[PDB]
Design a protein around this ligand. Structure first.
Ligand code: GL0
Ligand code: GL0
Ligand code: MN
Ligand code: MN
Ligand code: MN
Ligand code: MN
Lengths: 227, 216, 216, 227
């Protein structure tokens, strides 16, 4: 079955704010590895791929998204015959301002529950007029305190044995959620389709869910002395 | 100016159920800066990884050698660091999600703590050690609670002669299992001992282990 | 105190002769510091590689995109460097040993030169460019001679208004094909124009291409 | 057939010596890639593996070689099932003082021609009393101006169809060398065994050869002014 971990953290800068000589990070290799690090003294403890780093750079600098798609596609071609033959689904949240960046690569789409308005993650203009070898999508939303972001592989977005518009099927099981708990939602959705064929599943299944919070904890309020 | 925080969960099954899976998933978080999550239908190549240096330190960890040889060699690596490294202190916890073993690397760090039920043990082990490296492994159990910190937190409390003790007492006092709450409480406690004054940067990270096993 | 220098050669054939080979070999040299050579009977994993940063710059090179997009992005990468990088100038030449194509990355560097027979061409190409990045490719030919340098060499000559010209003239004058001799001669020339005075650190690197094809 | 490259370099430090803000390096992926870099401003342009880095650290710090062998062996086990299943033959020359370090891993031995004294690279005491899974050897010689160092894969150290002590066979073709040229020697040795079965070879063949030089070039003599 494999262990899950649940985690939390808290941080505060000397004098009551600005920047800190403390850094911290963590990462999970789904079902295999969890790591956490703390440091006191330029370096991040963890990073992406190598190809993901690259596609990230681009995702950043000015670049008109139509160009970037082209460009990502070109780097994607550099992959060792062959690893890019799969689907890459990547959301990257900036924790300062809640801005999200999506990077899809031949992948099922993903959804944001907000209140209950469940908009789907689609890029405003699907650019025509180029070669998109790897069926590469790229998107920005602006996330808000409370949003539930859900992500899955084909093995679950399609699972629904009664096929036919899985889009509006998902938003259905999504709008009908008592809970607000990432791990529950995940564990639910998993069930809410396995049922659809009893046990034994066709494909591989994974879903991840992420909730954005902006709570200010009591300790954040405690004032620090004047100069 | 509060940073956004993120809470996350995931679920996963193989074909038939299931030797392995060509599905794979990862997430990582740079504290207060960045969160990323990734799914791949292949999966092979891990989405995220330790930076360089670390990646070597991890190899030495996985390799069961004598503490003494580990420490020598870890010292070699960290000696060859750049002005900005520096190499500060490092506190690294790596947990095997299959058996819940855990390796611990501390490079001049403060200690950390595990809260098994009502006990609170502290993570330490037993010549030259240029950067003050300590390597430890432990077997964790469901419901265990791992607490790491900077010295800002662990050395924060005013007029206290035994930080180990102060910390164990506070942790025995927790009436909660939620690692985010625990992280906030401890932060609250330490601050209130100075009177809002934050002598140093303060970081606490809390990890709970779960072998919960769901309907499906 | 003279550094040791190394001269090297290698030969290689496959099974039957031969689609590919599970043999593999590599060498690398850190100038004046270190030489390493490696053989593997497998071979898969390359013994040596570009450091991080570079490895990305190389990906962007291999990827045929618009100079303008390359340059933007290369600038992004090198902007995120550490105090000590810094990121100085970089002059990178990567040659495909299969077709002899060559990519060239110059990050604020001085130019470099190819001597085809009696000609001496110079390696350059044609808004914002934060670190002054230039990307170029060229097809090389047997007997070509590639010359890279720091500014210490290329800007070394006293009271000279056209370093391009000075350099082409010296290179047309070489009565030798040996890249070590060429490297020493040019170094000699530049020094003698100051009178032993070395205003700056001086580096010259010379690469000759060979499609020689031996008895076997 | 693939191109070879031949290369040379020259360097000198400001003021007439000490250290320099210039660095340079190069590397060759045999038959596939050559790279050269120059910089002006901690970073080396090129590096080893990741596992090789590690085995290098050890090879350095004090460690009694018997321990190191053990230790290398342990890291070697960490390899992805499976890449270490092959043979690793690594010589690492320090250019300041000509000291060599060998690291063999289930690999044919290597030789140094010196004048004509052709000693073979063997470690003074083959340590017994442990598990050497990967048949791992480790050696230091002190190299001198003029030494020819030769390295090959099985495909050529064994090639000799008339088998039976290939050790003393190699030193035979080695002592009988008019030339002093790395690439000739290589290209010779290759031939000097292919002949032994006409064309078509059993295995894969590679040999590399390295000559150590300490020439002081004229320019090194030209004096720089007093202070
Ligand atoms: O319990 C939630 C946490 O899981 C961890 O594996 C992730 O890295 C993330 O930083 C958190 O969201
Ligand atoms: O021509 C000899 C040179 O070959 C290059 O591929 C190597 O990197 C080495 O630095 C030199 O020995
Ligand atoms: Mn699938
Ligand atoms: Mn501190
Ligand atoms: Mn200079
Ligand atoms: Mn072989």
């Amino acid at each position: 079955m494999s262990y899950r971990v649940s985690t939390g953290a808290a941080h505060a800068a000397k004098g009551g704010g600005l920047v800190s000589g403390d850094s911290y990070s963590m990462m999970e290799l789904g079902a295999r590895k969890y790591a956490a690090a703390i440091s006191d003294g330029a370096r991040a403890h963890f990073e992406s791929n190598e190809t993901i780093k690259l596609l990230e750079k681009i995702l950043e600098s000015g670049i008109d998204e139509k160009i970037a798609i082209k460009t990502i596609n070109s780097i994607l071609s550099l992959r060792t015959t062959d690893e890019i033959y799969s689907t890459l689904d990547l959301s990257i949240i900036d924790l300062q301002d809640a801005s999200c960046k999506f990077l899809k690569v031949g992948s099922t789409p993903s959804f944001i529950k907000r209140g209950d308005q469940v908009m789907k993650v689609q890029a405003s203009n699907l650019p025509i007029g180029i070669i998109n070898e790897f069926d590469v999508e790229v998107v920005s939303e602006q996330l808000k305190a409370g949003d539930l972001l859900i992500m899955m592989s084909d093995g679950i977005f399609e699972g629904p044995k009664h096929v036919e518009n899985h889009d509006l099927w998902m938003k259905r099981k999504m709008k009908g959620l008592k809970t607000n708990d990432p791990q529950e939602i995940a564990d639910l959705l998993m069930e809410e389709v396995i049922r659809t064929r009893s046990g034994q599943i066709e494909d591989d299944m994974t879903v991840v869910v992420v909730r954005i919070d902006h709570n200010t904890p009591k300790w954040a309020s405690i004032p620090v002395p004047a100069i």
